[PDB]
Amino acid sequence: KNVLKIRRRKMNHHKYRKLVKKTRFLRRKVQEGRLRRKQIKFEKDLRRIWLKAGLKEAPEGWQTPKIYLRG
Amino acid sequence: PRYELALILKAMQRPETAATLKRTIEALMDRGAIVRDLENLGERALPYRISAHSQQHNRGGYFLVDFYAPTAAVESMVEHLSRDIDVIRGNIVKHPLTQELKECEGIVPVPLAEKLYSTKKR
Amino acid sequence: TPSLRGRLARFGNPRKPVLKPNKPLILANRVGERRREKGEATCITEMSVMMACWKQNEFRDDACRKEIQGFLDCAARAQEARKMRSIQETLGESGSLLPNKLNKLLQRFPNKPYLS
Amino acid sequence: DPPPSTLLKDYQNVPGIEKVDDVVKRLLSLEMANKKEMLKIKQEQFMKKIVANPEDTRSLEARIIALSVKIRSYEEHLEKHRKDKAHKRYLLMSIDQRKKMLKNLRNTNYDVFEKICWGLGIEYTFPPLYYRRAHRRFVTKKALCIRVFQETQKLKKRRRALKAAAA
Amino acid sequence: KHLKFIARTVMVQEGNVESAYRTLNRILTMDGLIEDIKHRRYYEKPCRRRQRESYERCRRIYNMEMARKINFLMRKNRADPWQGC
RNA sequence: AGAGGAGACAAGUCGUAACAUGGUAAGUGUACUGGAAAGUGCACUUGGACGAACC
RNA sequence: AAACUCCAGUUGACACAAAAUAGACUACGAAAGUGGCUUUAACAUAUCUGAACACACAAUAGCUAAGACCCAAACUGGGAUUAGAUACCCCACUAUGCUUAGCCCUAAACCUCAACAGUUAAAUCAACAAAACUGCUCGCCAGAACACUACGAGCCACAGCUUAAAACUCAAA
Numbered sequence: 074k075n076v077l078k079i080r081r082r083k084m085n086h087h088k089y090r091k092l093v094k095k096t097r098f099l100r101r102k103v104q105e106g107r108l109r110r111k112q113i114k115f116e117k118d119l120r121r122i123w124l125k126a127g128l129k130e131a132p133e134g135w136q137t138p139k140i141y142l143r144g
Numbered sequence: 145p146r147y148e149l150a151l152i153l154k155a156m157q158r159p160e161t162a163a164t165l166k167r168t169i170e171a172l173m174d175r176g177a178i179v180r181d182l183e184n185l186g187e188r189a190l191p192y193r194i195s196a197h198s199q200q201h202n203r204g205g206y207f208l209v210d211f212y213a214p215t216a217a218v219e220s221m222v223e224h225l226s227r228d229i230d231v232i233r234g235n236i237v238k239h240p241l242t243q244e245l246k247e248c249e250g251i252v253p254v255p256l257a258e259k260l261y262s263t264k265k266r
Numbered sequence: 267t268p269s270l271r272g273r274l275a276r277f278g279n280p281r282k283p284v285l286k287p288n289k290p291l292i293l294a295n296r297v298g299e300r301r302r303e304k305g306e307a308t309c310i311t312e313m314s315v316m317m318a319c320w321k322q323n324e325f326r327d328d329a330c331r332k333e334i335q336g337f338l339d340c341a342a343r344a345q346e347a348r349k350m351r352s353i354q355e356t357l358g359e360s361g362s363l364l365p366n367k368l369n370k371l372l373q374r375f376p377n378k379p380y381l382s
Numbered sequence: 383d384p385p386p387s388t389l390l391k392d393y394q395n396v397p398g399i400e401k402v403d404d405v406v407k408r409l410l411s412l413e414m415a416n417k418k419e420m421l422k423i424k425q426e427q428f429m430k431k432i433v434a435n436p437e438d439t440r441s442l443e444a445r446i447i448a449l450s451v452k453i454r455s456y457e458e459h460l461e462k463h464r465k466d467k468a469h470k471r472y473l474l475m476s477i478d479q480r481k482k483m484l485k486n487l488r489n490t491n492y493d494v495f496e497k498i499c500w501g502l503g504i505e506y507t508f509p510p511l512y513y514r515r516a517h518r519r520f521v522t523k524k525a526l527c528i529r530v531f532q533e534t535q536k537l538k539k540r541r542r543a544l545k546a547a548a549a
Numbered sequence: 550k551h552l553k554f555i556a557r558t559v560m561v562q563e564g565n566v567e568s569a570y571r572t573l574n575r576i577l578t579m580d581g582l583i584e585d586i587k588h589r590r591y592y593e594k595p596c597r598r599r600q601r602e603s604y605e606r607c608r609r610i611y612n613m614e615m616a617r618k619i620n621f622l623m624r625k626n627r628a629d630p631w632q633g634c
Numbered sequence: 635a636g637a638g639g640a641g642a643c644a645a646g647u648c649g650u651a652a653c654a655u656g657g658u659a660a661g662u663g664u665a666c667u668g669g670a671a672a673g674u675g676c677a678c679u680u681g682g683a684c685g686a687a688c689c
Numbered sequence: 690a691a692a693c694u695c696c697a698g699u700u701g702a703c704a705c706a707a708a709a710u711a712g713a714c715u716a717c718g719a720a721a722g723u724g725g726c727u728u729u730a731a732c733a734u735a736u737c738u739g740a741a742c743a744c745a746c747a748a749u750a751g752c753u754a755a756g757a758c759c760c761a762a763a764c765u766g767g768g769a770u771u772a773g774a775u776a777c778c779c780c781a782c783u784a785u786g787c788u789u790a791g792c793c794c795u796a797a798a799c800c801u802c803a804a805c806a807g808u809u810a811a812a813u814c815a816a817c818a819a820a821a822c823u824g825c826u827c828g829c830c831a832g833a834a835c836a837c838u839a840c841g842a843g844c845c846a847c848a849g850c851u852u853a854a855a856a857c858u859c860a861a862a
């Protein structure tokens with residue numbers, strides 16, 4: 074068989090990689106912001122969990138971990 | 145298991161060769177081996193030059209030590225032979241007589257392979 | 267003859283294929299043509315002797331007559347041998363048979379990779 | 383492990399083996415043999431200790447005992463060769479096969495299954511119902527939910543004292 | 550480390566250096582050394598080496614079978630016994 | 635809303651990357667590099683060929 | 690041409706690199722892979738299928754940290770070629786290929802042909818390819834392109850990998 078479909082996929086992948094290389098800084102900034110918002114959403118969900126249960130504050134000795142930070 | 149140590153010793157006079165063989169067999173016994181036989185293949189020119197302990201050997205005395213040793217002693221004996229200076233080259237193998245030769249009826253002929261391609265007309 | 271059992275990738279063959287032919291392993295009813303041998307430059311040694319003698323004798327033919335004659339004889343022998351080689355190729359004595367006669371023989375007894 | 387002086391499985395049932403030279407006893411001992419002879423001796427000991435019929439090898443109990451000996455050998459091998467992925471796979475697959483065999487034996491013959499578990503020191507554990515990834519978010523939320531439940535239990539316990547005192 | 554003038558050595562007979570060199574080259578060719586050197590001039594990647602080996606094995610099988618058929622049928626190259634019919 | 639992407643519209647411009655051994659076989663993964671198709675390294679695939687007796 | 694002439698040739702000493710011939714053998718492994726020698730341990734399952742909701746592996750490339758460095762070699766530099774040559778050709782060298790400890794988890798990972806049991810009976814059979822099938826089970830597929838993409842989620846991965854759309858468009862692919 075010919076490689077026309079493979080050639081189309083090859084060009085698509087090459088152009089995508091070049092696009093990523095061109096905008097690798099704005100994408101990194103957007104990813105950092107998304108991770109921030111993701112951690113915020115997780116913390117809000119945990120807060121909802123302990124609020125619906127009647128606790129006025131977080132359980133004693135509990136601090137929500139930063140599970141999405143690079144560290 | 146039953147091992148055979150093929151030993152190439154530096155070409156020396158008879159007292160030195162006897163002392164080296166005694167030292168090697170004593171080391172084997174100390175590591176636990178039961179030595180069964182010591183066979184001399186004679187002194188002969190090596191097939192190729194061997195450089196052992198900063199010395200080039202052209203001739204060597206060939207010996208075999210058949211023995212029964214625990215599996216753990218083979219590594220220690222290899223280390224001991226490596227440290228020895230009178231041994232040009234020592235290799236421990238599993239005894240060839242241990243592996244029994246299965247009987248062979250004969251060369252079974254291989255017929256030409258068939259039905260590899262469809263019989264459709266081409 | 268090397269075995270073909272379990273070599274090609276086929277149904278019921280568990281192992282990975284050994285051979286991956288680009289053409290079916292089926293005998294054709296013809297053989298390849300009598301391939302020519304690419305000609306090499308000839309009489310180079312005699313030419314070298316003649317040219318070295320020319321260099322030593324300042325390209326004076328009178329001194330170099332013997333080597334010049336040797337080179338000329340080698341050249342004539344090479345040309346006549348090329349003609350004789352063409353004649354021999356037409357004859358086909360060197361090979362067991364010419365490709366044309368072998369193709370005729372294979373035509374008489376063709377391969378049958380099909381049923382009938 | 384069996385003592386190194388232990389004779390091989392084949393040679394321990396020949397008459398007069400106790401009257402032979404100590405060298406002969408050494409040669410026929412587990413000391414002068416590979417580890418698989420020791421594994422066979424271990425298997426024989428386990429069969430004599432556990433199964434009702436020591437001479438039966440096709441029974442599920444015999445298969446479980448042999449697989450347990452193989453598993454122990456694999457673990458001993460991996461303790462020295464910690465980067466042997468092939469034997470790691472063999473150990474894990476043998477563990478799964480032994481779990482399957484123990485499930486079958488427990489379904490078929492429970493008393494013998496208990497004898498197997500006691501003799502071989504196998505703690506038969508029922509598989510968990512759901513095999514799902516416990517990623518960071520899920521683990522953290524599960525931990526917080528457990529802590530919240532404990533705090534709510536404490537609050538519910540404390541709520542009773544005031545009502546009891548008031549009444 | 551081996552001895553010299555034993556391996557790949559051919560003695561010349563009555564100054565027939567041409568025949569001695571031909572014999573040496575034939576020995577190297579039959580043992581496959583010449584092809585090995587030619588292929589070792591540049592590195593042959595393992596996929597390329599496998600492809601070449603497969604092609605050469607298929608070629609050997611086909612050539613041996615064709616030679617067998619030719620030798621089998623060569624007896625039938627004789628004169629036509631029923632000429633005219 | 636500044637922009638990016640895809641498709642259509644289809645021009646002009648710079649090359650000719652692919653289809654023949656496409657003129658350096660093509661492609662996959664991956665890494666680096668380049669105006670651009672793309673180039674190169676490493677391993678893999680035939681969805682290439684090696685001409686199919688000897689010569 | 691550039692480059693080296695502390696270069697080349699012989700001889701001797703000489704490795705943490707790679708393993709002619711055997712191999713016209715077709716073996717081992719679940720796959721990836723595995724073809725120098727020795728030794729040790731060792732190659733699951735006395736029905737079969739079965740995990741993308743897990744566990745363990747997974748060529749090459751690549752990252753991290755410490756070493757080795759003959760040879761090869763992205764990048765880079767030089768020479769050449771060319772209209773240009775950011776390539777093909779030549780030279781030098783680095784990351785890298787190797788060792789150890791972790792990662793990364795991707796391949797035309799393809800024998801593009803699932804596992805098990807069975808048949809060659811016929812109604813054999815679109816074409817080509819590596820003949821046509823039956824029973825059972827699991828996984829996958831449902832026009833092309835958008836799309837090995839976006840968003841969401843998970844990951845030691847941060848220009849990444851896995852899962853993976855939709856809108857606009859066409860009568861094709």
Ligand SMILES: [Mg+2]
Pocket residue numbers: 081084085
């Ligand atoms: Mg596109």
Ligand SMILES: [Mg+2]
Pocket residue numbers: 656
């Ligand atoms: Mg082109």
Ligand SMILES: [Mg+2]
Pocket residue numbers: 658
């Ligand atoms: Mg090209």
Ligand SMILES: [Mg+2]
Pocket residue numbers: none
């Ligand atoms: Mg390429």
Ligand SMILES: [Mg+2]
Pocket residue numbers: 667673674
């Ligand atoms: Mg480049």
Ligand SMILES: [Mg+2]
Pocket residue numbers: 739
């Ligand atoms: Mg299964």
Ligand SMILES: [Mg+2]
Pocket residue numbers: 747
């Ligand atoms: Mg990997």
Ligand SMILES: [Mg+2]
Pocket residue numbers: none
């Ligand atoms: Mg380097």
Ligand SMILES: [Mg+2]
Pocket residue numbers: none
């Ligand atoms: Mg170099």
Ligand SMILES: [Mg+2]
Pocket residue numbers: none
């Ligand atoms: Mg270069």
Ligand SMILES: [Mg+2]
Pocket residue numbers: 787
């Ligand atoms: Mg190495």
Ligand SMILES: [Mg+2]
Pocket residue numbers: 678798
């Ligand atoms: Mg592969």
Ligand SMILES: [Mg+2]
Pocket residue numbers: 837
């Ligand atoms: Mg990809």
Ligand SMILES: [Mg+2]
Pocket residue numbers: none
């Ligand atoms: Mg993606």
Ligand SMILES: [Mg+2]
Pocket residue numbers: none
């Ligand atoms: Mg995303």
